Symmetry: D2
Subunit: 283 residues, 4 copies
């Protein structure tokens, strides 16, 4: 079963699929080993690892090559964040095939205008055209196109958010990712209740840690839950703490015992496989 079939099977079966953010292949491997359903190739986490704002500063190829390296490391589906498609429908058309060829099983594209000005969203018809270009360019029909509706964030209201969602589904979107920045999950939950479309919803509840997977499973219309930036946050917290301890203690004497050993990193690099290759082919 291909990774694309696996993703599709999850969406079609009604199971709740979980995806975790990853800013490099090692983190993606740890996510797979932890049991998540898929990897989220987050633009926010990649730009954060590079210490640059998440505002289309990183090159498209830096993200695309990272997607390729992650997909060649894990056996679970990869969902790629392609922001606004790096341009208009023509750019979308040329970019989607490269993400599919890099091994991603899905892309997430949002309806925000690019670049930011001093409208917040692109016209409904313009975005429908971008979604249609994405589904036209894919080679494997199992490849998934997810349209991200930013109407709530833009402060446009629930009625406009549902209208865009329905228009994107009409254009060929396989799932709709709806996002909220409200303090409470009231807004998001009201959208889910009102959602009239046939395709599944995708939530990124980073702003609402109180919404557990059990709470989300209770929402039959949601097919995917994404943990949007927890890997980079976990890494920053531990690195910052270990660096401060080394500088306070003037060394690694107290900190070494608590860290994973060098041998554990070498195993995560796939040393066992390398050992078999060396044993059978280094002659």
């Amino acid at each position: 079963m291909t990774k694309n079939q696996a993703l599709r099977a999850a969406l079609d079966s009604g199971r709740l699929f979980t995806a975790m953010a990853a800013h490099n292949p090692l983190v993606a491997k740890l996510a797979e080993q932890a049991g998540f359903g898929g990897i989220w190739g987050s633009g926010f986490e990649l730009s954060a690892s590079y210490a640059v704002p998440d505002a289309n500063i990183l090159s498209m190829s830096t993200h695309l090559e990272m997607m390729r390296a992650i997909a060649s490391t894990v056996s679970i589906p990869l969902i790629a964040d392609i922001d606004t498609g790096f341009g208009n429908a023509v750019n979308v058309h040329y970019v989607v095939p490269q993400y599919e060829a890099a091994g991603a099983s899905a892309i997430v594209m949002e309806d925000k205008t690019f670049p930011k000005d001093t409208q917040e969203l692109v016209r409904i018809e313009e975005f429908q055209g971008k979604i249609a270009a994405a589904t036209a360019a894919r080679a494997d029909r199992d490849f998934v196109v997810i349209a991200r509706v930013e109407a709530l964030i833009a402060g446009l209201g629930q009625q406009e958010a549902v209208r865009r969602g329905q228009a994107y589904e009409e254009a060929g979107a396989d799932a709709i990712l709806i996002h909220s920045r409200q303090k409470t999950p009231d807004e998001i939950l009201a959208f889910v209740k009102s959602w009239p479309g046939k395709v599944p919803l995708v939530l990124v509840p980073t702003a609402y840690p109180q919404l557990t997977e059990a709470d989300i499973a209770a929402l039959s219309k949601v097919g995917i839950v994404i943990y949007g930036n927890h890997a980079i946050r976990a890494a920053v917290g531990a690195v910052r703490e270990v660096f401060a301890r080394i500088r306070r203690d003037g060394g690694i004497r107290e900190v070494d015992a608590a860290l994973p050993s060098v041998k554990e990193i070498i195993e995560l690099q796939g040393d066992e496989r390398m050992r078999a290759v060396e044993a059978r082919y280094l002659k």
Copy 2:
């Protein structure tokens, strides 16, 4: 004062310079903020972040571009690990100028043969030629060339290790990095005592957490101490733990409070600077 002058000033002054491993620019920024003297652009940490063995599997350009991204983020000197120079003296000659142009203040090159066979080290004269090619290719004489002696690891003994160190210094090496895999730091300390050369020594005491910076400062001949892989180890430990907690709890309800906030990552991405640029130029 340029980063290269800063590094040189540290070596020449007699202060003990500390450098921390970094596998991406964010980690490098956290190292700078923590107070380390320099960043170590570790090939072991970069290959580990890609989940591939540290055996010249990653492309030279993947490491070189990472060095460029780290140097454009931090204000402290960057020491680049270039393994065996990606070839012979001709390759060294073409590669060193690219690392210098990427912003690194020093390179570390070791005398192991490449690629591994089924001798362990290259001939003394061959390596002298590689060091000479490195110092000939550098543009800024302040740029530092560090020769890494692997004779102890190769099991060749102390006398051969000192002989190579002296031969590399004669060829132009600005510092000698000596490494041991022995369980106890006895071997390393005996080498330091016996070292007759004029240039400073560089230690990577990952195998001896008991050797503190105070213990190393007591070794007048050592000018640099490098923490070789603690960033990737710290990151792996926290990521693996947070991923397991999310999967055990079926969500981020218990884990979110402990993590650095999204706002802290956005500040680390340099949002303040981005805010000034937006305020003054988005019109």
Copy 3:
């Protein structure tokens, strides 16, 4: 004298500076050897060499790395085509320092909106902000910022074209590149006559081969003439012809004599330098 000083000296002296398009470093080296004043790092020629449309399909990093490779090969100034700045003023701010660090002595940025819709140009004030962000981000004040006015191409008329030119110069543009698609050079020449600003003009007269350098030197207000796509055209013509001859003749028997020899390519690769490095450092 730095490449940036060289460019500046040309602009300030009143000499007419010539720049030739190059899609790779070899072509750039041939341009230098032929005697041109500078290299034009054409987005049209790079996208053509990749067989993709010149419509922001290539990644910014593919062009930036090509600029780096060209600047490390030639000793004459490189003028980089950065299209619309890969975004708004914030993107311009983050991108310009990378082009300067790659070795380019100037960038050319145009006032077209990106991406294309189904207004043609961005507002005058928005572009002024992008030019100001570019000149604020440069480190070396000798680095040159050239603003390309597309008002004539957009069919907006001469009065609006001059107004934008003056507004961009007010925002800090060091030169104004004005372009025409009219069949005859009447439109372009009328703009030059009317130009009231103090900075030099830049012409890309690809559409008017009848306008010679002597004709352009006669235009005191023009400081740079760029040959926009002749390298890729020359290469396509000869390659296509040699390929057809080989397939017609069933071999290279008739064609080999006319081609430059393998020895000539090896010299262009800088074999002599490589021979000195081998002789002095391979030991």
Copy 4:
């Protein structure tokens, strides 16, 4: 029929397959349009386009990404030059899957030692192990592994050249590429006559333009003829000539008529396809 099946079908059918060198996708497209059977992703042509010696100076990723861009442009098989495998059998194992995933239908790997010293070839058994690692790592059994024997160039004689060829075929090589630097094709033809193996031979007769395809078809044992560097030579000759004419004439007045038009380059960039995408999806 996949590109790999197409290549295999050519080798198995007994037809003589022709492959032309290409240093970028545009040249590769022109080769396809001219009628060649396949593209040769020459390391010599790519390093020449970058104005650097063909001595493993370019990064492996620079060549691999170029292979990816060429394969996504042409519909005919691509044969990738991977030099000595970028290391030993372990490196070969990690590299081959990346070339296959980039779209190449075959790789060519030679038995020279890397890097050059002050033996010329690696031991027969070491190379057999590298070939075995290559055929073990490929996913599609149709993917072709070509072993290049440099024994004649090394001055080791015909008997040793045939012995290596047979040993590499025993290790799994699908074809043997044999090369000569002798002035006359006597040496090469004698090798072909003596060749006792079952797999086809591959010739790169750049040094013998007198050996036509008809002469090679007459050699039943040769299954592929590669034109090794004619694209870069043709391009250099025309570019150098057009640049000299522009500088002599002080303009493009005399040269423009002879060049392919801008409209022809735009068609080669695939503008027609872009026009359909714009018409159907830009809304």
